[PDB]
């Protein structure tokens, strides 16, 4: 599995929601506030129960974990970079030595002149979004993830505006795409597909293994199914979108349910997400406490009312028990836990399976067949 | 004034809102919750500012202090009772020895057979209200408040239902009326008026002096103006109701105002009251913090934004400064204070002047002329 695997595996690090929350709690000295508020809840003195969930952040990007690793290299001189994984993009992105922005100054840069394997492309490319704007150009070189290498067309970034204060504060240089969506109109296959095209791997598939007992770690395996990660069979579901790791499922949280939901698999999302209305029904008379002024839902670890979460397909149900969707806060209050489930309205009837789901289910992402696979993860 | 006065004066004790709040805080162990919530407010982390004032108690009786004293006697044998003062009732009420209720069992009773001065009346009488029901009968005997005595028709109570858990928990036996409203249709003058009728006093007037530095004490003076309680002139306002200590005034709290308000003088009310809408405008951007889940508005003692409260008549303005409407909570948090101002909707455009007002203004209640008088209280 992780000691001498069959297919190429790389470890990656995760900054998670627990970590960010603890930072915020130390920063603002919030521990006693939280403790004293919970005590109030337990005495029956918060009432009848009010709705202070809005706190419309809302942003899916407020919920993103940073999945990063530093073992990928560009060119025959193996120029080193720290990359975060993005499950929706199919491009690789790095700062250019020619980057004029202040953001790029402390970052590792790609310098096409130092690599004998560089081939010029120069096709200009630009992302503009609410969070920020990146412009650069395509360049071709060797992209190596340890054991695997292929000549590949990535985006060399010449100007980066926004993505602050995160980008400057992070050690991350660029983004490595494990998705389907190419910014070009030149039909640049994902890195994983190109490996198969060039016969570097048997199949255009990868898996994510998130170990149950290390929430700062995950493992990416490329080019085959490493069976030592999981118990029992792999079940497969068909993608319901040509360019997203998204499937059709009926969602039931106890008596609260939604049929024909769109359910996106995104291991970089820090939590399970549900629509807001759906969430409200869920937490109502479930004895969960919203801490005033914080985006934080808490309850006792042994809460006997919390149901199993069910994601139903025509031939398999995936489930999460309370112990997989609660996070212990023992360092704040004995037997206190938080909900790793957040209300957020996306596309209608759209749900996200983030880190909590993948701590239970080993997941497989199959470009060749347009499927995702699920199996019970082993505890390694 | 209080050492050998000119007119008959009696001291009375007050259980106030501060005392009840501190009891509640000890009971439910709330000090640290309050402290930690305030700290949150001061860090700028409660936002933008939400409305959790409802908390529609609302009840004017949730705000009543208990003004009590134990020096009044009935009959020639001087049967002892503990009475609370009620500023709207004109009757005296005591438990009968014939009271069948469980409420009456621990109380002092009137026993008409033990008094040589009793004269039978037996006219039945009954109060029914939301808080409870009292039925009894009129009886006539000597009613003595120390220096003053007069044969007087009071209500002997034979059945008391409700008024719990207060009545059983209190040492109070009955109610002594300092108001205008008689339950009979036999035109029973208030005790104070009857004293004048029988030439026990010069005039049917009384005053309330509430000493600025003892919030558990007040003094009632009957039959004249004791000038050693106050500085400067007495100003008089005409009652705008035949049977209430109520006047016409324009109310301004900073830029928030209301013209031709009905303003009731009731020293037994624990706070200043204003309409809810009026209050909301007042506290908005005034840097006052509503503590979640408690009926409690707090702010720093030196708050430089808090305005003077103004109650305007055609020839006088009565005012309260922040220091007269804030109550220090130094035992919870250094330099923290609470607002002694509560939102409550009564009769439209009706306001109440309770204890905070009377800690600044010595007040006079004049049955002969249908006026109330106000002067600056001395600090004795």
Swiss-Prot record, chains A, B:
<keyword id="KW-0865">Zymogen</keyword>
<keyword id="KW-0812">Transmembrane</keyword>
<keyword id="KW-0645">Protease</keyword>
<feature type="disulfide bond">
    <location>
        <begin position="301"/>
        <end position="337"/>
    </location>
</feature>
<dbReference type="GO" id="GO:0006508">
    <property type="term" value="P:proteolysis"/>
</dbReference>
<keyword id="KW-0472">Membrane</keyword>
<comment type="subunit">
    <text>Probable homodimer; in the zymogen form. Monomer; in the active form. Acidification disrupts homodimerization. Component of the hemozoin formation complex (HFC) composed of falcipains FP2A and/or FP2B, plasmepsins PMII, PMIII/HAP and PMIV, heme detoxifying protein HDP and falcilysin FLN. The HFC complex is involved in hemoglobin degradation and detoxification of heme in the food vacuole during the asexual blood stage.</text>
</comment>
<dbReference type="GO" id="GO:0044002">
    <property type="term" value="P:acquisition of nutrients from host"/>
</dbReference>
<keyword id="KW-1015">Disulfide bond</keyword>
<dbReference type="GO" id="GO:0005775">
    <property type="term" value="C:vacuolar lumen"/>
</dbReference>
<feature type="disulfide bond">
    <location>
        <begin position="99"/>
        <end position="104"/>
    </location>
</feature>
<dbReference type="GO" id="GO:0016020">
    <property type="term" value="C:membrane"/>
</dbReference>
<keyword id="KW-0064">Aspartyl protease</keyword>
<dbReference type="GO" id="GO:0020020">
    <property type="term" value="C:food vacuole"/>
</dbReference>
<protein>
    <recommendedName>
        <fullName>Plasmepsin III</fullName>
        <ecNumber>3.4.23.39</ecNumber>
    </recommendedName>
</protein>
<keyword id="KW-0735">Signal-anchor</keyword>
<comment type="similarity">
    <text>Belongs to the peptidase A1 family.</text>
</comment>
<dbReference type="GO" id="GO:0004190">
    <property type="term" value="F:aspartic-type endopeptidase activity"/>
</dbReference>
<keyword id="KW-0926">Vacuole</keyword>
<comment type="function">
    <text>During the asexual blood stage, catalyzes the cleavage of denatured host hemoglobin (Hb) or globins. Digestion of host Hb is an essential step which provides the parasite with amino acids for protein synthesis, and regulates osmolarity.</text>
</comment>
<keyword id="KW-0378">Hydrolase</keyword>
<feature type="active site">
    <location>
        <position position="266"/>
    </location>
</feature>
<feature type="topological domain" description="Lumenal">
    <location>
        <begin position="6"/>
        <end position="380"/>
    </location>
</feature>
<feature type="domain" description="Peptidase A1">
    <location>
        <begin position="68"/>
        <end position="375"/>
    </location>
</feature>
<keyword id="KW-1133">Transmembrane helix</keyword>
């Amino acid at each position: 599995a992780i000691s001498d695997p069959k297919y190429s595996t790389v470890g990656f690090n995760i900054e998670n929601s627990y970590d960010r929350l603890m930072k915020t709690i130390k920063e603002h000295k919030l521990k006693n506030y939280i403790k004293e508020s919970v005590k109030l809840f337990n005495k029956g003195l918060t009432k009848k129960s009010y709705l202070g969930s809005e706190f419309d952040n809302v942003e899916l990007k407020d919920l993103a974990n940073v999945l990063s690793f530093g073992e990928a290299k560009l060119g025959d001189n193996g120029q080193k970079f720290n990359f975060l994984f993005h499950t929706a993009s199919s491009n690789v992105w790095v700062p250019s030595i020619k980057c004029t922005s202040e953001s790029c100054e402390s970052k590792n840069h790609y310098d096409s002149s130092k690599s004998k394997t560089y081939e010029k492309d120069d096709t200009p490319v630009k992302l503009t979004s609410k969070a920020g704007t990146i412009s650069g150009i395509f360049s071709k070189d060797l992209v190596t993830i340890g054991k695997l290498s292929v000549p590949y067309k990535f985006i060399e970034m010449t100007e980066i505006v926004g993505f602050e204060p995160f980008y400057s504060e992070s050690d991350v240089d660029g983004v490595f795409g494990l998705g389907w969506k190419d910014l070009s109109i030149g039909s640049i296959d994902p890195y994983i597909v190109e490996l198969k095209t060039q016969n570097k791997i048997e199949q255009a598939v990868y898996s994510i293994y998130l170990p149950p007992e290390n929430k700062n770690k995950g493992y990416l395996t490329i080019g085959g199914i490493e069976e030592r990660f999981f118990d029992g069979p792999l079940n497969y579901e068909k993608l319901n979108h040509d360019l997203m790791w998204q499937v059709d499922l009926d969602v039931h949280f106890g008596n609260v349910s939604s049929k024909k939901a769109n359910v996106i698999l995104d291991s970089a999302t820090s939590v399970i997400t549900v629509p807001t209305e759906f969430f409200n029904q869920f937490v109502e008379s479930a004895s969960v406490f919203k801490v005033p002024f914080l985006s934080l839902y808490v309850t006792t670890c042994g809460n006997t009312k919390l149901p199993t979460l069910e994601y139903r397909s025509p031939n398999k149900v995936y489930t999460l028990e309370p112990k997989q969707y609660l996070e212990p806060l023992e360092n704040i209050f004995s037997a206190l836990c938080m909900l790793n489930i957040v209300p957020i309205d996306l596309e209608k009837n759209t749900f996200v399976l983030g880190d909590p789901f993948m701590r239970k289910y080993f997941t497989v992402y199959d470009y060749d067949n347009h499927t995702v696979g699920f199996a019970l993860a082993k505890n390694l």
